[PDB]
């Protein structure tokens, strides 16, 4: 039925290794990882907000996120259906050793606009 848990074995797959590897192999994906990192930052710091819900994600996406959190030290939880992902802000949650913005230092071009721009609201 079920056996085995996280305890006797903690140190294993070096998360970083995975992330960094993805940044090199998938130089296009980085874009996303970066965005999430930003929101996650403003969130963690934001005390007013305790929990944060994420929009419906795909099989891959969901995975990517789950990783980022585990790296920052945050636990994720699935909703009644689990379709989406919800994370909270706990003490264990702290800043890592290095950020992704440190690997993309001295960029060439970037598109960051927060005006007359929406995401796309969907009605039932």
For the residues of 84-108, what is the DSSP string, one character each?
SEEEE--TT----S--GGGTS-S-S
Q: How was this structure determined?
A: NMR
Which residue range forms the structural domain that includes residue 40? Answer: 1-124
- Sheet containing strand 51-53, edge to edge, reads 51-53, 85-88, 76-78
* C-alpha closest to that of 43 among 110, 116, 93, 115: 93
Interatomic CA distance for residues 64 and 25, integer angstroms = 14
Spatial contact of 79 and 61, defined as CB atoms under 8 Å apart: no
> Which residues lie across from 86 on neighbouring strands?
53, 77
Interatomic CA distance for residues 74 and 66, integer angstroms = 9
Spatial contact of 100 and 30, defined as CB atoms under 8 Å apart: yes
At residue 60's C-alpha, the angle toward residues 58 and 66, to 5°, is 100
Interatomic CA distance for residues 24 and 117, integer angstroms = 30
CATH of the domain at 35: 3.30.1370.50
Return the number of other C-beta atoms located less than 10 Å from residue 95's C-beta.
Answer: 11
What one-character DSSP code corresponds to residue 27?
T
Residue 85: Cβ-neighbour burial (10 angstroms; 0-12, 13-18, 19+) = buried
Residue 46 tokens, joined: 């934001």
End-to-end CA distance of the chain: 38
Residue 104: Cβ-neighbour burial (10 angstroms; 0-12, 13-18, 19+) = middle
For the chain, the domain total comes to 1
What torsion do the CA atoms of 84, 53, 40, 60 make, to the nearest 10 degrees? 10
Spatial contact of 55 and 85, defined as CB atoms under 8 Å apart: no
């Amino acid at each position: 039925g079920s056996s085995g848990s996280s305890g006797t074995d903690s140190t294993g797959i070096d998360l970083h290794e995975f992330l960094v590897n993805t940044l090199k192999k998938n130089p296009r994906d980085r874009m996303m990882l970066l965005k999430l990192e930003q929101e996650i930052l403003e969130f963690i710091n934001d005390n007013n907000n305790q929990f944060k819900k994420f929009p419906q994600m795909t099989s891959y996406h969901r995975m990517l996120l789950h990783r980022v959190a585990a790296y920052f030290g945050m636990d994720h939880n699935v909703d009644q259906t689990g379709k989406a992902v919800i994370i909270n802000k706990t003490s264990n949650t702290r800043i890592p050793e290095q950020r992704f913005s440190e690997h993309i230092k001295d960029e060439k071009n970037t598109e960051f606009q927060q005006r007359f721009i929406l995401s796309g609201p969907s009605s039932g």
